Symmetry: C3
Subunit: 106 residues, 3 copies
């Protein structure tokens, strides 16, 4: 999928996590976020279209998805342990990573 | 172990995963793959032997193992949940990463 | 927290893991290490204070925390399976990563 579609999936499922009651719901949403983030990681964003694929900016963009995916994985571990509110809090804190990448590259 | 020996371990255990019936077998193979990939990550491949250790090519080579290890870890999570066929499908899709690194650096 | 405080947390909890009897104790310590390492990852160490934030040295410093966090996560998986002595051995081997970063940047 393209970058915007993956971002819609990330955005939608963050809201699913916020409204969830139980860990199964949180885990299903995190799994979809993980897939969307993995697919977005291969994108070239509009503001970097000319940069060399070996450029520091493209490498940093990809590192942003590594951070997001790592945090999603941590939230998934919490969900697997049934720590719903802790998983929801980790997902809430993902937003810092979304915003940081957006400030540089969106 | 050297790079070729770790690649043999990766290759052999990918076939173990393909032929497996149950998650214990898949998990044992993925664990061996994770160890081989972690050990290969420190290798300098023949086609990069002269490049500076701080070079973009050596950094990219190592990022290739980060990708592989991340995907192995995801397959391991699926195996831990008893999703044998989903774990086998994730392992099958690892091959895209093996091939991509081979195209650049083997 | 600052870098030194996060390093104290890493150091203290490595000793907790060494003295632990059971996986709950090991897991609690690894969780604190993961949080300290994630927080240290954003630090600029004294010996790199002038370097550009886009510099290879700052990027390599951050990759050192990626390695540490990955190894902590592997030890946590072992602890989750109740493999206390294997988790303790993985944590013992973390020290190679602590030392390698210290040799370059401390
Ligand atoms: C590492 C980079 C990065 C991360 C992390 C990231 N984004 Fe984005 N996001 C972008 C870029 C680049 C765009 C602009 C896409 C475009 O203009 O085509 C974007 C666009 C969007 C959009 C607008 C989509 C549209 O229809 O135009 C939304 C919503 C969004 N992001 C939400 C999120 C959420 C939620 C997260 C995390 C949970 C997130 N983003 C994490 C890079 C990132
Ligand atoms: C990030 C880099 C990278 C990844 C990922 C990677 N390889 Fe390799 N692989 C290499 C390189 C480099 C060589 C060449 C080694 C040499 O010539 O000494 C190689 C060689 C091999 C060989 C030949 C071994 C021999 O005896 O000569 C096999 C088989 C192999 N890889 C299989 C795999 C499989 C299976 C995977 C994933 C499951 C994989 N590789 C992933 C870099 C990689
Ligand atoms: C990727 C880099 C990196 C890793 C990994 C790392 N350290 Fe450090 N560590 C540093 C740096 C840089 C300093 C120096 C901090 C300063 O001088 O302010 C330091 C300082 C320390 C100190 C001295 C703290 C003090 O009070 O002055 C201790 C103890 C320590 N590290 C232990 C550890 C342990 C234990 C680990 C792993 C389990 C570890 N470090 C992993 C970079 C790292
Ligand atoms: Cl795209
Ligand atoms: Cl080698
Ligand atoms: Cl600091
Ligand atoms: Ni896509
Ligand atoms: Ni070796
Ligand atoms: Ni990098
Ligand atoms: Ni801090
Ligand atoms: Ni995990």
């Amino acid at each position: 999928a393209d970058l915007e579609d993956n971002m819609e999936t990330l955005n939608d499922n963050l809201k699913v996590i916020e409204k969830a009651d139980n860990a199964a719901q949180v885990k299903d949403a995190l799994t979809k976020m993980a897939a969307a983030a993995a697919d977005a990681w291969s994108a070239t964003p509009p503001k970097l279209e000319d940069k060399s694929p070996d450029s520091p900016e493209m490498h940093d963009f990809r590192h942003g998805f590594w951070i997001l995916i790592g945090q999603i994985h941590a939230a998934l571990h919490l969900a697997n342990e049934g720590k719903v509110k802790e998983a929801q809090a980790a997902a809430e804190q993902l937003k810092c990573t979304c915003n940081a990448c957006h400030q540089k590259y969106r």
